Symmetry: D2
Subunit: 231 residues, 4 copies
């Protein structure tokens, strides 16, 4: 199976697989069952911002998710990613819907990684229809509204259920290197999760994977396009 | 054929393809025959730095190549690259040798492109043996001395003739987009030693169509960039 | 007198100091009479973006001013700023009003200078009421709407006439150094509304000696930059 | 008194004021008695590198000090700097000598702070004789060898004792802002501590202070130019 490190913006409590009984943000290290979560007020139809930060010195993977009204949720997890991630990775965004659905629209995404310097930095503040530096997987699509639709949206604009999709940056990322004194990464994305369902589901994740990571089969819904099972 | 924009550090004067009669830096737009050149003193065995600068505003592709002693050569060419390059490109380093040879060692390479924002920036100040975010073409190799040898160097450290190689950054780059108010790029690389009577053939920073490959027969004076000298 | 290099967004044509007979962007080198101008459609009440670009390599000071609808004006001037500016400078925004007026509201300002490295980069996408890393001169104020009002605006939001103000970045900037292979700077700011029959007088990004102050009598057409129109 | 947050590269054990009984790196929050230290092998005459990292999300001030042979020491301290530092600060480097001495030469210094964006980033890879964007205090001098000599060095090159000096970046830095979701800073400097003394002393610190911070009187030696006393 792939190796996954992720920050999940989990809109739907799957309390049967360890989700807290509210929407939450989580840090996922090789499991959809987050090593740490925080209660998250997802604001339907509002543009949220997620920032993810890690460095090899503090060894603390952190994320904050905020909306324009000031509300935010933060979660941090002490982890030495040198010991979890392959040296080379791809980085991406994933999202899913299941029985319940939502738009999992990404409006921007930036990422920086540095080994201290080697560095990779990309920023998408607009996505093209033919976003050649993105590898789209599953239902993920770009263009023509400048956004990245991680999961299926019909032409009328309504999200679809049982959808999973991801967008990986095209280039592999050298995420750690033994000679490096510091290896840091940061990611920011903005998103717009909207649903008229009974409940929104399932969420968006920023993830770091093996370079050849693919959507595991059956990873819609609770599995967020990141894992083959809920273990 | 590929579409190439390149800044060449041309160590070897090939005067019947229109090179000046001295080593030179050149701006190449879709031709190995540089639109503009400047005399360049390649300092054998010294680490050089090339800086290449463009923006969609001043529409001036500029390059400076310098050495630590301060000597430098600069060339600039007014060109609207929106009218030469595909929107999407790959960026790379190329080098070649021919009858005469030189090491074509890249010690570092950075690149930034911004559309104003979408942006891509990378920097390699050390290359790895398996540099997964580089597409190596031809004779180019990395590692583990931290360098990118664009052209073949044997075990004894002697550069080989009729070698060509390139290194492209893995990801396509969105180098211009018509609504961009500013589409700027910059590249810097550090790098050439030869015990030949003359070093050749040079190194280029280049920007190419995404699927660019070394043109057949582009060793020597063609710098791995062009299928011919037209 | 101060030494000024400026990019002016000149909303008001003062044709007997050599302005063109339309609103324009201009590159000013030690004179309010721009060395180069381009016709500029200031879009009343819309947020504009100015980008200013220079490097010691192409030696071309360029500016583009644009609006969200895509309209834009660009001006470029070939100049070796090593020969005009002191090595150390302050960088700023200036604006003025005269008989006619406009808000001269800065919504953001970034600046990068690099000597290739020594570097300074700042960005303000929000200004604070007490913006300690800005030196405000004349009528310029910040806060707490997140903006920098270079010129006086009364409570009712009406801009006042014969207002001049500037905002300099607190730290001196080492804008060139003779050994620098590349001394580049860039600045971007976003910003103008008037119910006057004509907006005036404009906004400038400028680079000045470190101790630069508003010249006496530099409201109106002098843009807070120059003691006279010579 | 000033408010000081600092990362100290403490070359001299003052075990009578809480120093561990070896050279160490430390995180100093309003006291010279470090809240956390790590044993540090200062390599006489070698060029070391210090990286300091903090962000308002993880709230962990971290530092690593490394030398070209690979040896490094790291120290991290969980602290919410919002609650310690004034909103506006100056950032600097300080060093001292006492009864024992060393060069406290800085060869480069970079700093970045961001509020998420407002940002300040400066880099000095060479210091000029007239480094106008540095406020030099005490014995600190620049030019003409491209370095910043935090403490006194005689013309023959030997460091002097009972020396204290600092270099602050000229502009105040907006280090936190209540509206910011993230406020991060990073600092890197390289240094060359060399001594032919019986023991080197006293060390170098990167520090963040109130904007009007000055060398406290009598802050040579153990106090590293940062504090008025050893409390
Ligand atoms: Ca869930
Ligand atoms: Ca040639
Ligand atoms: Ca005018
Ligand atoms: Ca001590
Ligand atoms: Mn979950
Ligand atoms: Mn040539
Ligand atoms: Mn004018
Ligand atoms: Mn100590």
């Amino acid at each position: 199976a792939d190796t996954i490190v992720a920050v999940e913006l989990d809109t739907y409590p799957n309390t049967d697989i360890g989700d807290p009984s509210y929407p939450h943000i989580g840090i996922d290290i090789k499991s959809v069952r987050s090593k740490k979560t925080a209660k998250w007020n997802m604001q339907n139809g509002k543009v949220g911002t997620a920032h993810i930060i890690y460095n090899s010195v503090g060894k603390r993977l952190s994320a904050v998710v905020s909306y324009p009204n000031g509300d935010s949720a933060t979660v941090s997890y002490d982890v030495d990613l040198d010991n979890v991630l392959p040296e080379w990775v791809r980085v991406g965004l994933s999202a899913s819907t299941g029985l319940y659905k939502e738009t999992n629209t990404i409006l921007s995404w930036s990422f920086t990684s540095k080994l201290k310097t080697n560095a990779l930095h990309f920023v998408f503040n607009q996505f093209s229809k033919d976003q050649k530096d993105l590898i789209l997987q599953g239902d993920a699509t770009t263009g023509t509204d400048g956004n990245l639709e991680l999961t299926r949206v019909s032409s009328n604009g309504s999200p679809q259920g049982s959808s999973v999709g991801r967008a990986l940056f095209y280039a592999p990322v050298h995420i750690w290197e033994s000679s490096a004194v510091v290896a840091s990464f940061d990611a920011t994305f903005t998103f717009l999760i909207k649903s008229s369902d009974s409940h929104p589901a399932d969420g968006i994740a920023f993830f770091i994977s093996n370079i050849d990571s693919s959507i595991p089969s059956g990873s819609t819904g609770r599995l967020l396009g990141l894992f083959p099972d809920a273990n």
